[PDB]
Amino acid sequence: VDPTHFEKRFLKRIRDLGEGHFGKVELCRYDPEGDNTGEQVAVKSLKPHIADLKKEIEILRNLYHENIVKYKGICTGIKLIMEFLPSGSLKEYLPKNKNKINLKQQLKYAVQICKGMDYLGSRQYVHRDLAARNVLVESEHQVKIGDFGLTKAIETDKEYYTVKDDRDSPVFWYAPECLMQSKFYIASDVWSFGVTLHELLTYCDSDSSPMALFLKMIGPTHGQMTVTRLVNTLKEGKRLPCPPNCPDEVYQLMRKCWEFQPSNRTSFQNLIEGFEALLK
Numbered sequence: 461v462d463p464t465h466f467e468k469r470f471l472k473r474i475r476d477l478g479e480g481h482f483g484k485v486e487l488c489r490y491d492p493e494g495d496n497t498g499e500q501v502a503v504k505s506l507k508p509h510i511a512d513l514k515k516e517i518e519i520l521r522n523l524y525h526e527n528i529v530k531y532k533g534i535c536t537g538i539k540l541i542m543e544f545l546p547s548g549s550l551k552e553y554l555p556k557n558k559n560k561i562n563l564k565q566q567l568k569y570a571v572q573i574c575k576g577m578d579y580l581g582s583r584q585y586v587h588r589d590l591a592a593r594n595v596l597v598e599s600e601h602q603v604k605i606g607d608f609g610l611t612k613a614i615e616t617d618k619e620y621y622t623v624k625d626d627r628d629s630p631v632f633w634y635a636p637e638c639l640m641q642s643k644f645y646i647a648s649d650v651w652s653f654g655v656t657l658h659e660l661l662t663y664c665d666s667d668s669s670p671m672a673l674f675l676k677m678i679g680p681t682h683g684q685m686t687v688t689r690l691v692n693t694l695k696e697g698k699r700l701p702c703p704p705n706c707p708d709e710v711y712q713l714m715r716k717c718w719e720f721q722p723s724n725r726t727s728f729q730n731l732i733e734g735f736e737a738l739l740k
């Protein structure tokens with residue numbers, strides 16, 4: 461018996477956790493005894509991309525970090541089995557838990573996301589989808605990167621992966637090089653982290669989301685010209701505003717994520733040092 465091979469007949473669906481465009485995550489109980497005593501697991505499957513899910517499974521199987529969701533196995537068509545984190549995504553958790561989470565805890569979550577991302581970068585991978593909706597809450601003290609659906613390998617001595625299909629792109633979290641040439645560097649993930657940090661600091665408020673704020677900056681009636689207008693505004697040096705009640709020193713670290721050139725752009729190691737200095 462392979463402990464990473466889950467039989468479909470014992471995988472009992474409890475409820476949906478969330479869904480994207482092509483995939484969904486469900487809470488299941490892996491119950492081989494048939495008495496509802498088995499382990500609860502999160503199960504990722506595609507909506508009725510198969511090649512892309514198989515590649516994602518192999519990436520997650522080889523990632524081992526305290527701030528990266530734990531791979532548990534597969535159910536072979538294929539389903540990805542992972543550990544279940546009851547508090548859900550940061551996007552759902554933060555609006556309901558503002559009383560429990562203060563600035564100090566937000567900065568500790570920030571460090572933890574940087575550590576998981578720095579580990580991913582060390583394994584030569586680029587995430588391409590770093591947003592609060594992809595960060596999971598293990599407890600009020602810990603977060604983990606919880607999805608690798610768009611993750612791609614960066615070639616040795618190369619700075620980037622060349623994206624062919626831009627159709628599932630979160631453009632309001634994307635660096636200018638991603639928008640203009642679909643060039644994905646580890647530096648492009650640092651840009652997206654800065655956007656995720658803005659979300660975390662606003663408690664993932666929908667009205668102050670990166671999409672809502674950029675649309676107010678560029679105008680919301682540009683239709684197919686929207687990304688072009690977003691590129692123009694970023695070239696002008698305009699950036700997302702400072703979250704209410706966010707100290708200028710934290711906003712300054714955020715601004716360093718948004719240096720136009722993917723060179724004036726810092727590393728995750730550099731950001732960790734910044735946040736730790738603010739925590740002491």
Ligand SMILES: COc1cc2[nH]ncc2cc1-c1[nH]ncc1NC(=O)c1cnn2cccnc12
Pocket residue numbers: 477478479480483484485502504529542543544545546547548549552593594595596606607609
């Ligand atoms: C990262 O969250 C998601 C990832 C996705 N991919 N496709 C759909 C999709 C949906 C979610 C999602 N949207 N709202 C909550 C969640 N996820 C969880 O509650 C969850 C708990 N443990 N767990 C383990 C692995 C992945 N997800 C989880």
